[model samples]
Target: KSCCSCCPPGCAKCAQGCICKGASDKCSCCA
Candidate 1:
């Protein structure tokens, strides 16, 4: 699986898939 951050322009590769962080105000994605 893979993940990408829309706010900070980042990404990660993970076997478990993408995980989301932060709240409604700000958010990030990772794998």
Candidate 2:
């Protein structure tokens, strides 16, 4: 699933959970 593209640049984890489960390492929002 896609994450909020509006995610903060310095975000280590998503404030909103994705299918990856907020794992920044797995989520592109943090990638």
TM-scores for all candidates: the values are 0.19, 0.20
Lowest summed lDDT over 10 consecutive residues: which window, candidate 2?
1-10
lDDT for 16 in candidate 2 is 54
User: Whose TM-score is greatest here?
Assistant: 2
The lDDT of each candidate is 0.40, 0.49
lDDT of 1: 0.40
Best by the lDDT measure: 2
Q: Per-residue lDDT for 3 in model 1?
A: 45
Clashing pairs in 2: none
Candidate 2 C-alpha lDDT tens digits along 1-31:
3364445444556555543444444555455
Which runs in model 1 stand beyond 4 Å of their true positions? 1-10, 13-15, 21-25, 28-31
Give residue 2's lDDT in candidate 1 (0 to 100): 28
lDDT of 1 by residue, 1-31 (tens): 2243433334442334545545443454431
Q: For model 1, which pairs clash?
A: none
